[PDB]
Write a protein that binds this DNA or RNA. Structure first.
Lengths: 209, 38, 176, 142
RNA sequence: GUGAAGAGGGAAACAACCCAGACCGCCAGCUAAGGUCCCAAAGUCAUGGUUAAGUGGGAAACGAUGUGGGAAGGCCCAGAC
RNA sequence: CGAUGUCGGCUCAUCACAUCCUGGGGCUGAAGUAGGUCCCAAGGGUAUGGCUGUUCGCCAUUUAAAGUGGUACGCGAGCUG
RNA sequence: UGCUGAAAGCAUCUAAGCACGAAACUUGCCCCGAGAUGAGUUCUCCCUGACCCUUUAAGGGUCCUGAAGGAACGUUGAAGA
């Protein structure tokens, strides 16, 4: 399933006559250019190569510019090859936008997680702290639940440590479509989207039945 | 049902049958006496 | 190992054609069966059959004692086939045939809606009788054993799919 | 005089192929390992390479004795908490038939990397053909 | 009796148990226990019987027409399961 | 004997199955709703307070389970006294 | 849960021959992942050079000419000890 690459902006409310204000996450679409169209020549597969919107491209390298010359005359953002499924997906006719959401009402959104620095355990991993009461000092928030006794000898991922977390691929599947307008190029969903304003938000309709 | 650990040949309508490595009780007159293993 | 001695006997309505391991048999049940004598060898005498062991295959008369039954079951299979014995009990319960798809209503959320194997027909002469049609004695018994397994017969109600048999598994009530 | 001490400049490479039709896995894998080690060419040294390159023509044509398709459990583990991962010939042969002999020789070859030095000379294929017609592998018998 | 104060080959392990006693060198051979599938060297050993349990290579009551070989007993060619 | 600091608690799980809740099959003196209760299985799931150092035992109130157990009878270069 | 069926006329899910199926599980989804040394694929971009010496089938020197690109050095941040 092709992703539409919507970018993060913010949340709004939209109301109904029963006074319910209906908070919804906002995404404004610009859609794909389509820049290769692969069919059969490499490993029998079909793939679109989408390219999103436009960019200033003020310092691009020749390895990028020689590809922009065969893609068109205006330089887009990203790449995303997007492999197509047999009898399920097509590249033929007009290129597609928000008609992906005309009857499918659950979606998935890939993005990039925020940087947690030290990360730790008692916030990120739902662990309890030690209390500063009863004359207790020196170890209140310091991790140390790592063994017994000599029996463990090797460590599994149910044990948690400090170290850099964030700045990698993260995906959410909690989102429900509340309003779509193809003439306003607008998608409104219930629930929140990961990471920072701008970014990418790859956004595609759900494949779970 | 039960398995217990041993089987008896208590009536004439019971014959006791070994199928696919296991011995079992079946009685067409009384399902109360179904038993596995022996 | 006594049954490999048997003459088997065949009706006039079968011509019994043979070439090496391949036996070709046909009759008025719409079937043209090609069955194999690969591990054992059979000899025909126009009305009777004799089986025996092959070179490089199992010794004695045991694997031959099975081969007679399968050939008899196919001589029957191509001439007239096998008779009905599967039944349904319960009011509003219904068996139905939708081409290669079968239906069985048992008071539940969906009517089975299952699709038949290769080489078998289903028929319902009344909504509580189930007949399976073909030439293979196995598929017409295997599909009945897969069909009877849906919800299984109820103890006091007696309801569900049953066989014609003098034994009773329906239970009677007790005083409290 | 001393017995033959091998120099690393002695090394030689030739290509072979063997048909798997109806053959029992262990009676093929043991014969394969003996030719893989180079016992027809060079011996009396683990200090120098002795092996020759050999193709198993079609892995889907292999068999096992009696009921042994259900035999063995192929246990392995390293971590991700407890639980031993198990396999069966009946689950390999319909997925990738090349796999059943790729695992078989691993107890027949010596030690650690000394057996791996011969495992680099092994090829297995499925589908009645291979990719090495330019190496001209010579046919083995029987 | 060995070991305590006796090394070596074997029982992959194992003072002692098995075998056998230690000067040193062998571009030697014959024997001991033990081994002869394969890491791992020497029988993919031969002959006959046993055997579906991977038992062999951890385990009892009991049960099944488990199953090889036998004799005595009943049922029996005028006739038996 | 040139020191594997003493009981329970908190933190923290993790393995077993003679399975507690979940599933699969069944007999019932199971007509139905409940109940009694035995094979098969380790994917997912199994309570807090009072006096009391006490976990526990007793009690109060709650469960789908508050299951029966192993972990130096799981707790100090981790804590309280 | 099993069908057709022998060895053991019958009987049998098994011997020859072939089916159903669990909250479990492989693919499917979501994320990682070719040091997968078995290191796979494909597209976009670039460079079209000589000489001296020697105990040299190899080293030590000099000059022409350095692409595509990368980094330092900066102004710092959605990234950070």
């Amino acid at each position: 399933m092709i992703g539409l690459v919507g970018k993060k902006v913010g949340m709004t409310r939209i109301f109904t006559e029963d006074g319910v204000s209906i908070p919804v996450t906002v995404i404004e679409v610009e859609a794909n250019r389509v820049t290769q169209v692969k069919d059969l020549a490499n490993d029998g597969y079909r793939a679109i190569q989408v390219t999103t919107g436009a960019k200033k491209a003020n310092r691009v390298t020749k390895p990028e510019a020689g590809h922009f010359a065969k893609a068109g005359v205006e330089a887009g953002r990203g790449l995303w090859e997007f492999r197509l499924a047999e009898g399920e997906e097509f590249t033929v006719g007009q290129s597609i936008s928000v008609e992906l959401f005309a009857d499918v009402k659950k979606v998935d959104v890939t993005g990039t997680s925020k940087g947690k620095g030290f990360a730790g355990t008692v916030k990120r991993w739902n662990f309890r702290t030690q209390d500063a009461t009863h004359g207790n000092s020196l170890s209140h928030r310091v991790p140390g639940s790592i063994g017994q006794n000599q029996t463990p000898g090797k460590v599994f991922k149910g044990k948690k440590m400090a170290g850099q977390m964030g700045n990698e691929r993260v995906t959410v599947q909690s989102l429900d479509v509340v309003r779509v307008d193809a003439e306003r190029n607008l998608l409104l969903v219930k629930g929140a989207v990961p990471g920072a304003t701008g970014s990418d938000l790859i956004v595609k309709p759900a494949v779970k039945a | 049902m039960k398995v217990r650990a041993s089987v008896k040949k208590l009536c004439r309508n019971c014959k006791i049958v070994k199928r696919d490595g296991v011995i079992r009780v079946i009685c067409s007159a009384e399902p109360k006496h179904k038993q596995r293993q022996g | 190992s006594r049954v490999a001695k048997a003459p088997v006997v065949v009706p006039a309505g079968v011509d019994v054609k043979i070439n090496g391991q391949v036996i070709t048999i046909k009759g008025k049940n719409g079937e043209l069966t090609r069955t194999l004598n690969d591990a054992v060898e059979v000899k025909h005498a126009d009305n009777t059959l004799t089986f025996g062991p092959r070179d490089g295959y199992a010794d004695g008369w045991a694997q031959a004692g099975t081969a007679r039954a399968l050939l008899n079951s196919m001589v029957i299979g191509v001439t007239e086939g096998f008779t009905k014995k599967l039944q349904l009990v319960g009011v509003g319960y219904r068996a139905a045939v939708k081409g290669n798809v079968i239906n069985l209503s048992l008071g539940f959320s969906h009517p089975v809606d299952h699709q038949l194997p290769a080489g078998i027909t289903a028929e319902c002469p009344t909504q509580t009788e189930i007949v399976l049609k073909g030439a293979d004695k196995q598929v017409i018994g295997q599909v009945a054993a897969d069909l009877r397994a849906y919800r299984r017969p109820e103890p006091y109600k007696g309801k569900g799919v049953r066989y014609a048999d003098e034994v009773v598994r329906t239970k009677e009530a007790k005083k409290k | 005089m001393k017995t033959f001490t091998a120099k690393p400049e002695t090394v030689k490479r030739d290509w072979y192929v063997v048909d798997a039709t109806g053959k029992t896995l262990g009676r093929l894998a043991t014969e394969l390992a003996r030719r893989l080690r180079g016992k027809h060419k060079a011996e009396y040294t683990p200090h120098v390479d002795t092996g020759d390159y050999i193709i198993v023509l079609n892995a889907d044509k292999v068999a096992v004795t009696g009921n042994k398709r259900t035999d063995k459990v192929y246990y392995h583990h390293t971590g991700h908490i407890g639980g031993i991962k198990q396999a069966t010939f009946e689950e390999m042969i319909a997925r990738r038939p090349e796999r059943v002999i790729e695992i078989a020789v691993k107890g027949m070859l010596p030690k650690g990397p000394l057996g791996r030095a011969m495992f680099r000379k092994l090829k297995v294929y499925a589908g009645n053909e291979h990719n090495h017609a330019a190496q001209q592998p010579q046919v083995l018998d029987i």
